[PDB]
Design a protein around this ligand. Structure first.
Ligand code: 04C
Ligand code: 04C
Ligand code: 04C
Ligand code: 04C
Ligand code: MG
Ligand code: MG
Ligand code: MG
Lengths: 195, 233, 212, 222, 196, 222, 204, 196, 195
């Protein structure tokens, strides 16, 4: 767990998440997918303390899927992000808090708009055009400040994302073994296999 | 790096129209133990200066020796040692202030708070403070330890600013000091009834008073007080 | 701080911010973080304000004594090594210095040396130093090419500091630009972020995260 | 364990004009919650039209001023009574402060006077010798209160020309000695209201080509 | 604090100074450290003012409730209730209490309860910071079956010395006399006891 | 804080300063430290500000309910007992240092309570950072058989000592007089010896000085 | 690890002639990293305005909590809550978490609909009410705001003038604080109209 | 330790217990804590045994060298040398010393030197852990210009109580008499002093 | 400073040293040469505390070069390694020790044999067929235990080295930006430019 990025463009939300899982002086895995599909048009990437990350992601996933079945209706990205924030806001004052940071990328079908939410382990929610957790932000934010435009296409967004990954691969101390990229739009969630 | 062992409490002082008054009790405390009861903490230098010292007594005795030695050194090759080239309060203070700051700068302080009270050669009142940190300041009223918290408020009612000094007589000023010493005896757990007082006037000179006692104390109201709340008997 | 300097086709660009901090207190917005050692040598500074200011002014004195003694301007390598050897003597004492000794000489050509207070000394083409170095790296690296023009290189250096001044809470105030050529260093003005940000936003169409 | 530092409170303020410069400071001296003196000056005439103040820990402050005063004296002896310029004084002070880099003087120092073109000059220092010339500086306990007010009223920060759509900034101009003293008095009364270590009295030292003049004003004594 | 309780021919007498300190500052110079838990069962309080006060209030409540059901309690019973509170809450309390009372059968009795919560029945007891300075004096001068005037002098002279040497003790010397006759409060001012 | 309580002929009077602090900064220049527990039982508070307000309201609420239950006017010893048992239970963590006073069918009373739950009785008392400055005055001027006017003077003088000499106290003097047989009179800002002097200048800006990006009407209605 | 200075931010409130003003910056960061320049810190429940500085998760949580409580208030009381009453509700709610508090510096502002009186108030994290005639300040640049307000402020300012004073107080205070700024919003509140203005400030 | 020195009509008498402790273990029950630094200048040692011993040896060396050059030193001079060592090395020493000596001009003199290194000239002095318990007793019972037999009884009764209450004090009571007549060593065993 | 390797084969000594110089969350340089030529047939690689490394390497270099000039003679690899060890052995009991670990690869011209010495910052010298400092050893030693043969050629040694670098690039957490490889043999020291 280290690098998770998010870029909201005109008609979609793109999440990039690193594949490395490291413990000690050993990279145990180089093909790890650090996301869960919460609903057909909502995707959550995550990063933080070992164990906590997946346990939290799956717990949220279960709850949203339960809601979907009960109401036969998909919850809006805004509604899901508020639910997630509250869970983390409870957590931070628990005996043992979830040390997990998340990005929630979703496509609102009612508004026909992509939405990207950044929530840290304290329960600090913000809607952004682009987001990042951990040390990644110290490089990507300034880069995106320069190169980002609000009316970009998904293809333009992927090139913009490639520019971030290249910079991170150049200047980051750790080998994060590349990223898995996923796109969230009106047609749902799909994975870019060749990145 | 020190810790103070045998200690002296408040030294209080103020200016009046013709000079200055200074006072300090005769106690040498050993923590909560009131160990030594015959300790003089006012030390005259010449016939025009009195140094009042609080804090560690061993360091006080070291400072006594320094002042005693300063008088000797000043007399060397000095025909005007008892006249124009006599030791001034300002000279004595600046010397101590220099030492105090040098010692704190070597991380080996003289664990004291000092008040140098006196009258200069031109008749001007001198009253200035210095402590273990080398911090110095002057004011119409000066006090150390508990004196700073309890005496100064009372003495400042008499002399609140510079313009109040000519309006304050020696009778009024001494009465305020003696009252302050009583209040300190009521409220300071490391104070004694017995104390010494010194007046340095530009006309009548140095008057050193020993074996004074706090008197006219109000204790009679204590008999009516019972328990801490609901207790009647 | 955020400071950078990079080598390119037309010499060296050097750009710095102007903010001083005492914790979260903004101590100054108008501080000079490029010291002019001689007409051919510049020194950027980041870290402890007094350490930087004192020792880089001291460095200039040592460089002056070199050319008096040797009848020749000191090399960038020798100048940087005087400073690195100095801070190495103080290693562990708590000095905080991130400097980049930039200059031109005949034997070396355009040269940049990174030197810091724990003794590291590195020759290189690109360096960014300070609390906001990462923000500067992000913009600088993604737009850098060797074949940049003097006009484009000056702007990229300016734009990289601006990026860091924006995101880094401990960087800002204004941008000081310099250009080092074979003929010496040339000052390219002070640029207040108060006006520069909006000027860049409007003209470039960037900074869409901010409420325009 | 023995702690060699203390906080004597108070606050200081320097403003530069076209042909003058002021260095103000309150006359209160404190330790913890006690008042030591209601009138203890900490702004000093050091000769050669240089005024100085080192606010923070008074023992260190007095020591530094004392050393700089002595530095000015020996500058005259060693260089044929030459006048110490304000820029030269500032660099000298840096070396005094940095000399104790690893056991610092706990003070924020400010000096004021006239530069060699006869124009008003204020220099300000951190505890270990870092310095910078400015038109404006507040130092000490209430520096965080006073400084932003000075940015607004002396350097006209965040002030634009009315009706220009926030495009044209308010033009920079020198202030008169009358207008500067107004800002000083208001700065200190405002600081006295909200900071417990500031009060009692205000002493301003004004520096012109003619010399060093003083002005005193009462402040709230609570 | 300096405090003591002394048994004698006609009953028992409790004695105490009047100084309460918060550091070196005297918060109260006319404190009443002798407190009533029952008609003729009193106690001297030393240590934490808050703790000893809270305890004495609970004891007073227990003995009032005891009296309602089973009549007048013994001095031993009172000491047992003090002990129970002090012992079971020893980790959270700083209380050194001397319990003294007068029965008609048992006459004068004195129980001392130090920090630990142990009970010790004694002819006389001394406690508090200033008591250290009078162990020598009290041991040499105490006698059993003293008169009222002798016991008052013994306590007055003892506490006078404790006050003289202990900075944490001072003010007036309060005393409470417990006999068949009833309850008598006594007070002695500095001008009297200092020059003994 | 500085707070005092003084007993007199036919009742009791309490007083307080009106300064609130956060660090060295004055948070409130005119806060109310005199608290009504019941109509004729008032309470001066020092220590953690919120704790003194909360603990005095809670006990005041329960005293009111108790007064209605018993069909009797509340007593000071009841407020005293409830306050000390509450404070003791929290082992000092509720940082309330109170001077409790009032009149009831038993008579006039004056107590002090500390944060850990210890209570004292007295004819004159003082608590807070400026209690030593106040107690110095009380010890110098207090006597037996004070009148109403003399007690108010002594109480306010003791608060003034704190206002001037203690940095943790300032601004104004609040007083509350509780006499037997009469209504308790709450004298808010009895003395105001720290009025801010006229400012040297008006800083009213020319309209349009501030640069604006957007405007919009906010909807507050349904 | 000081909750009050992780995210950063400031709020200031002022009174005028028959009006009140409340203003805040827009920054949300994680220490040195600036993250969001849209994070508003002023909320409103009916005609009562609440500004909140401090730990951002608690800022959000408390807004959601006071929306919750004021909504139930309105349903049961059949009227909008007033600033004086709301101030008490904020104090109660904060003191309820006495030994595990919300790390916030809230500020209430509004005009009483019955009396027409301008009202402002501030709180510490634990509930202590700070009522004031002139102004209230809060946040990481509180010292700066105190200095600006105490010098710039004068009583009975007209809405158009009051806007200039509060805006200049906020802007110049924010520029001397590393964790505050990145945009600003000012609410001018009259008896039955409310104007919201976004200020242009330096973005560093 | 319990130690004391007392001036009287004919001169001065030094007194001490004989217990040396390493924790709760008594390392030596017959210790000699009264040590000679000159013919008629002796001292009582309390605190660190090693420190007081090293100091006393240096003082003995200084006074022997003083005697070679300037003749017999005064008791004040001896106390000054003790002070100088204790004061200048206060950070590294734990020594509480009582200096007592007999001049023919000045008669009996007693100087006490606590931890700090301060000097205090007194009619009598008490020191060491066990002295705390006899401040009350000694103050009430001391008189100036006592006889030899009275002073011996005063010290014996005082140290008896100090020993009785202080665990760090015990064994025999050693005494040293300093008069014009000469130097006399006295000893008193438990069977005698315990039942006083 | 992190990865330094050494392999002694039949007729040469091969040293591989990582190119990354990292401080904080930034790779400041990716082309750093972590060696110094002590003499024509003796090469020393180094790794450890920042500043100390180069300061020590150059100090040793100066001393050996001084010896070479004085005697007009090259010191043997064994002699150089003993000198280096003693300097580190002095250092460890100094006020501020050099925190530097080194490998000394040299070709002894008198014996016509390659020699590899591993010395840590304590002054712990060992002659080895293959060596490594830092976390590298935890992977490379076992790998070389398996694949190493004493009679290998320089070309075989480079392939064996490629096998180590590949393993480190796979399992090490940090990006060390590849290695600079240098060969020490009878003809002196030369750098492999394409690795
Ligand atoms: C950015 C702002 C990072 O803060 C830059 O590094 C900046 C560079 C700079 C260069 C020249 C002139 C001014 C500023 N550095 C600072 O602003 C610096 C930050 C810093 C503070 C303390 C440090 O501990 C060693 C390291 C860096 N700020 C200062 O030096 C401030 C003005 N002064 C002090 O904090 C005074 N301290 C310094 C340490 O010794 C005790 C006194
Ligand atoms: C003498 C002074 C000391 O031994 C007495 O024991 C005296 C007993 C007494 C006081 C009033 C009424 C009846 C009996 N005790 C005190 O005066 C006491 C000193 C003390 C403080 C703390 C202790 O450990 C918990 C033990 C003794 N003073 C107080 O309790 C005062 C009122 N409060 C404080 O000093 C504040 N304390 C509270 C507890 O935590 C430390 C700070
Ligand atoms: C004087 C001013 C103390 O200096 C008084 O005791 C005053 C009493 C008072 C009572 C009612 C209304 C206003 C004022 N106390 C304060 O002003 C108090 C000072 C204080 C700060 C910190 C303390 O303990 C850590 C204790 C006393 N100020 C406050 O309570 C302010 C409003 N709040 C804070 O400083 C923040 N609190 C949060 C809760 O934890 C303690 C710090
Ligand atoms: C009584 C016992 C305690 O006050 C006396 O002061 C007595 C004085 C004495 C002893 C022998 C000869 C002449 C005079 N002191 C001791 O018996 C002394 C107890 C003591 C130990 C350490 C101290 O602080 C440094 C102070 C007093 N006992 C010893 O010195 C014995 C011989 N040694 C130890 O206990 C070992 N100590 C050495 C110092 O460091 C701690 C361990
Ligand atoms: Mg005050
Ligand atoms: Mg910034
Ligand atoms: Mg024994």
């Amino acid at each position: 767990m280290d690098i998770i990025l998010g870029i909201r463009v005109q008609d979609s939300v793109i999440l990039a998440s690193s594949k490395a899982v490291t413990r000690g002086i050993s990279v145990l895995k180089d093909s790890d997918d650090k996301t869960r599909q919460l609903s057909p048009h909502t995707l959550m990437s995550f990063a933080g303390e070992a164990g906590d990350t997946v346990q939290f992601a799956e717990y949220i996933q279960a709850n949203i899927q339960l809601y979907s079945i009960r109401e036969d209706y998909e919850l809006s990205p805004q509604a899901v992000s508020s639910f997630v924030r509250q869970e983390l806001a409870k957590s931070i004052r628990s005996r043992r808090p979830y040390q997990v940071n998340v990005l929630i990328g979703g496509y609102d079908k009612k508004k026909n708009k992509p939405e990207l939410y950044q929530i840290d382990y304290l329960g600090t929610k913000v809607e952004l055009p682009y987001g990042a957790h951990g040390y990644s932000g110290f490089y990507t934010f300034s880069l995106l400040d320069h190169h980002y435009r609000p009316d970009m296409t998904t293809e333009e967004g992927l090139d913009l994302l490639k520019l971030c990954v290249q910079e991170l691969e150049k200047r980051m101390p750790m080998d994060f073994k590349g990223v898995i990229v996923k796109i969230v739009d009106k047609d749902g969630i799909r994975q870019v296999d060749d990145f | 790096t020190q810790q103070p062992i045998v200690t002296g409490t408040s030294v209080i002082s103020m200016k009046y129209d013709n000079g200055v008054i200074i006072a300090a009790d005769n106690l040498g405390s050993y923590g909560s133990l009131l160990r030594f009861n015959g300790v003089e903490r006012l030390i005259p230098v010449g016939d025009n200066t009195v140094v009042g010292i609080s804090g560690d007594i061993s360091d006080m005795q070291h400072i006594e020796r320094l002042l005693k030695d300063l008088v000797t050194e000043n007399a060397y090759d000095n025909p005007l040692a008892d006249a124009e080239e006599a030791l001034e309060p300002s000279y004595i203070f600046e010397y101590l202030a220099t030492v105090m700051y040098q010692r704190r700068s070597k991380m080996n302080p003289l664990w004291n708070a000092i008040i140098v009270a006196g009258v200069q050669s031109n008749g001007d009142q001198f009253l200035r403070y210095v402590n273990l940190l080398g911090v110095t300041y002057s004011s119409p009223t000066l006090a150390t330890g508990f004196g700073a918290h309890m005496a100064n408020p009372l003495l400042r009612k008499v002399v609140d600013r510079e313009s109040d000094i000519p309006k304050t007589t020696v009778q009024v000023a001494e009465e305020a000091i003696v009252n302050a010493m009583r209040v300190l005896y009521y409220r300071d757990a490391r104070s004694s009834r017995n104390f010494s007082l010194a007046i340095i006037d530009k006309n009548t000179g140095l008057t050193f008073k020993k074996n004074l006692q706090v008197e006219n104390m109000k204790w009679d109201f204590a008999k009516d007080i019972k328990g801490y709340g609901t207790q009647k008997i | 701080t955020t400071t950078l300097a990079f080598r390119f086709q037309g010499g060296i660009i050097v750009a710095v911010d102007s903010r001083a901090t005492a914790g979260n207190w903004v101590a100054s917005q108008t501080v000079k973080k490029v010291i002019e050692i001689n007409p051919f040598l510049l020194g950027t500074i980041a870290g402890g304000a007094a350490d930087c200011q004192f020792w880089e002014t001291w460095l200039g004195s040592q460089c002056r004594l070199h050319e008096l003694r040797e009848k020749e301007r000191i090399s960038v390598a020798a100048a940087s090594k005087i400073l690195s050897n100095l801070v190495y003597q103080y290693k562990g004492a708590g000095l905080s210095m991130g400097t980049m000794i930039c200059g031109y000489t005949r034997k070396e050509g355009p040269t940049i040396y990174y030197v810091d207070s724990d003794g590291t000394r590195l020759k290189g083409d690109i360096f960014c130093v300070g609390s906001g170095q990462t923000f500067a790296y992000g913009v600088l690296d993604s737009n850098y090419k060797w074949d940049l023009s003097v006009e484009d290189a000056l702007y990229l250096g300016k734009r990289s500091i601006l990026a860091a001044a924006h995101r880094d809470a401990y960087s800002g105030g204004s941008v000081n630009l310099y250009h080092v050529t074979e003929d010496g260093w040339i000052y390219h003005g002070n640029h207040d972020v108060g006006e520069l940000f909006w000027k860049v936003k409007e003209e470039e169409g960037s900074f869409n995260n901010v409420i325009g | 364990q023995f702690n060699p530092y203390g906080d004597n409170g108070g606050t200081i303020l320097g403003i530069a004009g076209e042909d003058f410069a002021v260095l103000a400071g309150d006359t209160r001296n404190i330790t913890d919650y006690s008042i030591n003196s209601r009138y203890e000056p900490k702004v000093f005439d050091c000769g050669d039209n240089i005024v100085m103040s080192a606010n923070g820990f008074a023992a260190d402050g007095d020591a530094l001023v004392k050393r700089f005063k002595n530095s000015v004296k020996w500058y005259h002896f060693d260089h044929n009574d030459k006048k110490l310029s304000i820029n030269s004084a500032a660099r000298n002070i840096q070396h005094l402060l940095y000399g104790k880099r690893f056991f610092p003087y706990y003070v924020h120092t400010i000096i004021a006077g006239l530069d060699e073109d006869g124009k008003g000059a204020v220099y300000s220092f951190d505890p270990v010798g870092s310095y910078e010339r400015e038109q404006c500086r507040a130092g000490g306990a209430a520096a965080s209160l006073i400084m932003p007010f000075l940015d607004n009223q002396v350097n006209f920060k965040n002030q634009y020309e009315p009706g220009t759509n926030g495009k044209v900034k308010k033009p920079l101009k020198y202030l008169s000695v009358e207008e500067v003293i107004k800002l000083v008095r208001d700065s200190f009364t405002s600081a006295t209201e909200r900071h417990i270590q500031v009060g009692d009295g205000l002493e301003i030292l004004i520096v012109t080509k003619d010399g060093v003049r003083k002005e005193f004003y009462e402040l709230k004594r609570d | 604090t300096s405090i003591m309780a002394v048994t004698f021919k006609d009953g028992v007498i409790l004695g105490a100074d009047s100084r309460t300190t918060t550091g070196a500052y005297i918060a109260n110079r006319v404190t009443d450290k002798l407190t009533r838990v029952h008609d003729k069962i009193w106690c001297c309080r030393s240590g934490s003012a808050a703790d000893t006060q809270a305890i004495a209030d609970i004891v007073q409540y227990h003995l009032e409730l005891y009296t309602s059901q089973y009549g007048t309690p013994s001095t031993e019973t009172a000491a047992s209730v003090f002990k129970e509170l002090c012992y079971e809450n020893k980790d959270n309390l700083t209380a050194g209490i001397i319990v003294a009372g007068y029965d008609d059968k048992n006459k004068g009795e004195v129980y001392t309860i130090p920090l630990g919560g142990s009970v010790h029945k004694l002819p006389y007891a001394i406690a508090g910071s200033g008591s250290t300075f009078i162990y020598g004096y009290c041991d040499k001068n105490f006698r059993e079956n003293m008169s009222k005037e002798e016991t008052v002098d013994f306590i007055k002279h003892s506490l006078s010395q404790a006050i003289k040497w202990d900075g944490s003790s001072g003010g007036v010397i309060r005393m409470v006399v417990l006999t068949a006759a009833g309850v008598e409060r006594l007070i002695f001012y500095p001008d009297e006891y200092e020059q003994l | 804080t500085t707070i005092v309580g003084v007993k007199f002929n036919n009742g009791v009077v309490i007083a307080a300063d009106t300064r609130s602090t956060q660090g060295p900064i004055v948070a409130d220049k005119n806060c109310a430290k005199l608290h009504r527990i019941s109509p004729k039982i008032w309470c001066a508070g020092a220590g953690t500000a919120a704790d003194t307000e909360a603990v005095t309201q809670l006990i005041g609420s329960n005293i009111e309910l108790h007064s209605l239950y018993t069909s009797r006017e509340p007593r000071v010893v009841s407020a005293l007992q409830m306050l000390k048992q509450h404070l003791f239970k929290y082992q000092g963590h509720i940082g309330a240092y109170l001077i409790v006073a009032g009149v009831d069918p038993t008579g006039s009373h004056l107590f002090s309570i500390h944060a850990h739950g210890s209570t004292d009785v007295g004819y004159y008392l003082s608590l807070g950072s400026g209690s030593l400055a106040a107690m110095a005055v009380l010890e110098s001027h207090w006597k037996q058989d004070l009148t109403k006017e003399e007690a108010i003077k002594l109480a306010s003088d003791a608060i003034q000592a704190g206002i001037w000499n203690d940095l943790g106290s300032g601004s104004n003097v609040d007083v509350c007089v509780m006499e037997i047989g009469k209504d308790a009179e709450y004298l808010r800002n009895y003395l105001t010896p720290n009025v801010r002097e006229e400012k040297q200048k008006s800083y009213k800006f020319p309209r349009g000085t501030t640069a604006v990006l957007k405007e919009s009407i906010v909807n507050i209605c349904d | 690890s000081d909750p009050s200075s992780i995210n950063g931010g400031i709020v200031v409130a002022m009174t005028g002639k028959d009006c009140v003003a409340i203003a805040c910056d827009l920054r949300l960061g994680s220490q040195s990293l600036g993250v969001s320049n849209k994070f508003e810190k002023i909320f409103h429940y009916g005609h009562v305005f609440l500004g909140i500085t401090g730990l951002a998760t608690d800022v959000t949580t408390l807004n959601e909590m006071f929306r919750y409580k004021t909504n139930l208030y309105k349903l049961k009381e059949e009227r909008a809550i007033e600033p004086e009453t709301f101030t008490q509700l904020v104090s109660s709610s904060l003191y309820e978490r006495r030994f595990g508090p919300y790390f916030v510096g809230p500020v209430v502002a509004g005009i009483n609909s019955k009396s027409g009186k301008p009202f402002i108030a501030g709180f510490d994290l634990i509930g202590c009410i700070d009522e004031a005639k002139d102004f209230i300040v809060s946040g990481t640049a509180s010292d700066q705001l105190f200095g600006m307000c105490e010098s710039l402020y004068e009583p009975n300012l007209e809405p158009e003038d009051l806007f200039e004073t509060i805006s200049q107080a906020l802007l110049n205070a924010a520029d001397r604080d590393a964790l505050s700024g990145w945009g600003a919003v000012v609410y001018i509140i009259k008896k039955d109209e409310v104007v919201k203005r976004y200020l242009k400030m330096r973005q560093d």
